[PDB]
Amino acid sequence: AASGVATNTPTANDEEYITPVTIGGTTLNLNFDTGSADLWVFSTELPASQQSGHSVYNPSATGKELSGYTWSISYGDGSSASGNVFTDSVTVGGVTAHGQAVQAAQQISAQFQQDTNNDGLLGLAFSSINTVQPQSQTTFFDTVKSSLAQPLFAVALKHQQPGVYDFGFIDSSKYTGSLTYTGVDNSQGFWSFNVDSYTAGSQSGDGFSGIADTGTTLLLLDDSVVSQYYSQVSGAQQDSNAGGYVFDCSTNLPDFSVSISGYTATVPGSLINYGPSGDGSTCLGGIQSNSGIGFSIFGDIFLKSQYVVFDSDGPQLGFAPQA
Amino acid sequence: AASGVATNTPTANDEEYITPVTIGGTTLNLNFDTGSADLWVFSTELPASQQSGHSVYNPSATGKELSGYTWSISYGDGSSASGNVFTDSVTVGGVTAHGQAVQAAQQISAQFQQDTNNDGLLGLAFSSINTVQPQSQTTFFDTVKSSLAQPLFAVALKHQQPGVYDFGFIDSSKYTGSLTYTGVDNSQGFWSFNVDSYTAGSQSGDGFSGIADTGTTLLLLDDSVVSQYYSQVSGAQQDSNAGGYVFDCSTNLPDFSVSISGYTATVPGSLINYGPSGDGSTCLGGIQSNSGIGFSIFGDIFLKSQYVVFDSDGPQLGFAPQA
Numbered sequence A, B: 001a002a003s004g005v006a007t008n009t010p011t012a013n014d015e016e017y018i019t020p021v022t023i024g025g026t027t028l029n030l031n032f033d034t035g036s037a038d039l040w041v042f043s044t045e046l047p048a049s050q051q052s053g054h055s056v057y058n059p060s061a062t063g064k065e066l067s068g069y070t071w072s073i074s075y076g077d078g079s080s081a082s083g084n085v086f087t088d089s090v091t092v093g094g095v096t097a098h099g100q101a102v103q104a105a106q107q108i109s110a111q112f113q114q115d116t117n118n119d120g121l122l123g124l125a126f127s128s129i130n131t132v133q134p135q136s137q138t139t140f141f142d143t144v145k146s147s148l149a150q151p152l153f154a155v156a157l158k159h160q161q162p163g164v165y166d167f168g169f170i171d172s173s174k175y176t177g178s179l180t181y182t183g184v185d186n187s188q189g190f191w192s193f194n195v196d197s198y199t200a201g202s203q204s205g206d207g208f209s210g211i212a213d214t215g216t217t218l219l220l221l222d223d224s225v226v227s228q229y230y231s232q233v234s235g236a237q238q239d240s241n242a243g244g245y246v247f248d249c250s251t252n253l254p255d256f257s258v259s260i261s262g263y264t265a266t267v268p269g270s271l272i273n274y275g276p277s278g279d280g281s282t283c284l285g286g287i288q289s290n291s292g293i294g295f296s297i298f299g300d301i302f303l304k305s306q307y308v309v310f311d312s313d314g315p316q317l318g319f320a321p322q323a
Ligand SMILES: COC(=O)[C@H](Cc1ccccc1)OP(=O)([O-])[C@@H]1Cc2ccc3cccc(c3c2)CC(=O)N[C@@H](C(C)C)C(=O)N1
Pocket: A033, A035, A036, A075, A076, A077, A079, A111, A112, A213, A214, A215, A216, A217, A218, A293, A297, B133, B134, B135
């Protein structure tokens, strides 16, 4: 049976985490995203000017084209990308998926062009939400899942240090104590789970649902919860240039936690100071608005505090404090 | 319980069929498409120049916005469209879906801009393939299905005459004899069914699968089957300007049939003469290539010969010769 450890590395301020992936023999630095079921890459089909500053997939040499197939993704921030599809060999952490669908980019919007830190995204959400037309494809994980020793992956994202994606086994040295599991609702293709309550500093409130999403930088919560959190942060104010609420970098931030199946997942206030806001001399808050969507996005700020097991058996998520 | 009859009308040469749909009180002429799960419309969010020659949805007056939601579709011909989403009242054949998701167009490609015959598409495929992000929406049919007298719809497309979409009941006067049912595989979100064999004129061959797709003008089959068909048509030759194989308009075309669960669905040769090719003095063939996709597209050319029941119970498709 297979397993492997793929090492991830955060970019500045942990805006994203990149992990190398060898496709048809070329290694690309991809953003692993548990909130997406697409594996899309910068490719030789983009205009040459858009290829600059990236490693790019060249399908002509090794890929098998799925003639007539397309893909396209659109985000609420206004970003988008689209293209065609080839199958190829895709290796992550020493685990190879043969015949894996690779969505080659033909078009990408400004946000993607501007980020030279990654060459695309590798999706780890459920395959039911893969965007390939006319017949959807399986994610890297779903492709290799039955070959793994256990049909799961796990992740340790860290603050300014390398982390791991463990495929096919659990590394118990990556957390303190025992894992606590909770059921996953995959009906929207996400690793969605329920929280029974939250505590934002001095205030506690009702539970809600959310999704474990490595592809989102911050922890996105309902506006009401965000307001209660920042009401406790002296001088906090919104700055749309920065991304939301910002505050003096020396501020002592409250912790934020959620109760999941009896386990308290605590994000220490230190991890809620994302870093320099990039708009003068303030720091950006790790907690921000989910913009009214009615469910929470447990992005990197939250994940940095935990080791999280994504188990297809259930399916279910396991959590414990990161060690 | 509800039911209703929506009348469809073919454009020139039956290139598509349009059916009126009232959205937030504005009536738009939509292309009903059993091969899509999206209900997308030209809207006031398009550039004004792109709105010309169309009726357009104005969400400001009646729609409820799903903030942060997007949609985007990409086709193998290179067409595409994308936008945002609102829920609104959508009435088809006197049957109203309250709170139906309406995908307002913000961007549309040339093929859509150029066709002033429709104001968008109303999808009737399974909701599992709806493209709305971050949470997919239900089609008009899935929205109203449990309110209907029976959870099915049926369609009679005709050559140069008005036809119907029957919602919630079967009109037995629309076909000869009794319906024959066959099981549907909805795993790719399509009304996919199996054929046991086909007969292209003087040649018969092995079975295959395909999808009942009102949104495709022609009958698309494997290249091998297309070649065998046209090998029997004197003077047939491909013309990429026209869309594929063309031939003298007076040619006597062979029939084409498929065996489905013991019922023979025959498309008479008369219906295989699509019409003027629009490239000099030849006519376009109703049968063309599926471009290597490995499954057949039972588009309008085929559907014009049958009455077809799309029954969610099973699910299953019923067929009989159109009356
Ligand atoms: C449809 O599912 C998504 O798009 C999934 C899950 C989701 C669902 C709803 C709300 C938010 C997230 O997002 P994702 O694939 O992880 C998606 C990945 C992604 C795509 C383009 C981006 C462009 C600029 C910046 C970021 C991007 C991230 C950083 C960022 O965290 N952006 C968030 C937004 C929400 C601040 C984001 O769009 N993240």
